[PDB]
């Protein structure tokens, strides 16, 4: 569908935010603010891969990967996948799977011994089909 | 108690690795290897707080914090708590609570709207008593 899978770019920022609005609260932010947040995230070693409708530049898929170096397991890192979102119109098109697989490969290439992510009840089957298995439980505290 | 709560430092690394042995697989690493990992972790913006028996410098408690900015919710960050471990000998000292609360305060200071972590079934009660609530499920893929 004229889709490209690539790292996030500055010009993507506004469209990317709209996309994320399908996941959680996504109040409007200025270009400068979004760019500053992107820089913050990059410093934290986060990578964001997106599916872009190349002809128009519209962002229709996103997934972020955070690699965490560890002292344990002989110093092998852990890949944290988060904020996996796909445009409603493209659900069942395989974008989600492609994003996850891509991030898993990146993790593997960087010495990670495992990739972890948090899933809702509804998404369990999706992740299990990709080889993921339910393990620990996410605990949350709101500040 | 003779204990002090402070940030992890290079002189702690070896004793720290020994402590982590109580949480998961932690094969031996050289001082050079440990130092490099600690470097990589700081580069990722990871903060590690430890309890230290000052007289001997033995590390008896540890908890790490990764603050990740998001594009959503107006750019408010999420506090990711990782690798919480307390020496069994201090099972009655309440170090776990102190460590978690400390990281939550740091998270608060950085504008985090929530703090999340992955808990084993065995640690569930500990976290729920601290005010954390069971949320989404952790999915894991071994590489």
From TrEMBL, chains A, B:
Keyword hit for rRNA-binding: no
Pathway assigned in UniProt: Nucleotide-sugar biosynthesis; UDP-N-acetyl-alpha-D-glucosamine biosynthesis; N-acetyl-alpha-D-glucosamine 1-phosphate from alpha-D-glucosamine 6-phosphate (route I): step 1/2
Annotated GO MF terms: glucosamine 6-phosphate N-acetyltransferase activity
Keyword Transferase applies: yes
Catalytic activity from the UniProt record: D-glucosamine 6-phosphate + acetyl-CoA = N-acetyl-D-glucosamine 6-phosphate + CoA + H(+)
SUPFAM superfamilies to which the protein is assigned, alphabetical: Acyl-CoA N-acyltransferases (Nat)
E.C. number: 2.3.1.4
Entry GO terms, CC: glycosome
This protein's UniProt keywords: Acyltransferase, Transferase
InterPro entries: Acyl_CoA_acyltransferase, GNAT_dom, GNPNAT1-like
A Pfam family per the record: Acetyltransf_1
A single GO BP: UDP-N-acetylglucosamine biosynthetic process
Segments forming domain N-acetyltransferase: 3-143
PROSITE patterns in alphabetical order: GNAT
Similarity-based family: Belongs to the acetyltransferase family. GNA1 subfamily.
The name this protein goes by in its record: Glucosamine 6-phosphate N-acetyltransferase
């Amino acid at each position: 569908v004229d889709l490209e899978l690539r790292v996030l770019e500055e010009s993507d920022l506004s469209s990317h935010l709209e996309l994320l609005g399908h996941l959680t609260e996504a109040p409007p932010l200025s270009g400068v603010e979004l760019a500053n947040i992107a820089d913050m995230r990059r410093r934290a070693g986060i990578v964001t891969k997106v599916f872009c409708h190349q002809p128009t530049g519209r962002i229709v898929g996103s997934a972020s990967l955070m690699i965490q170096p560890k002292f344990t397991r002989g110093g092998r890192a852990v890949g944290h996948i988060e904020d996996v979102v796909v445009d409603p119109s493209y659900r069942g098109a395989g974008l989600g799977k492609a994003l996850i697989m891509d991030l898993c490969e990146i993790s593997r290439s960087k010495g990670c011994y495992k990739v972890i992510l948090d899933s809702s009840e509804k998404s369990l089957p999706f992740y299990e089909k990709l080889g993921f298995r339910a393990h620990e439980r996410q605990m949350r505290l709101d500040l």
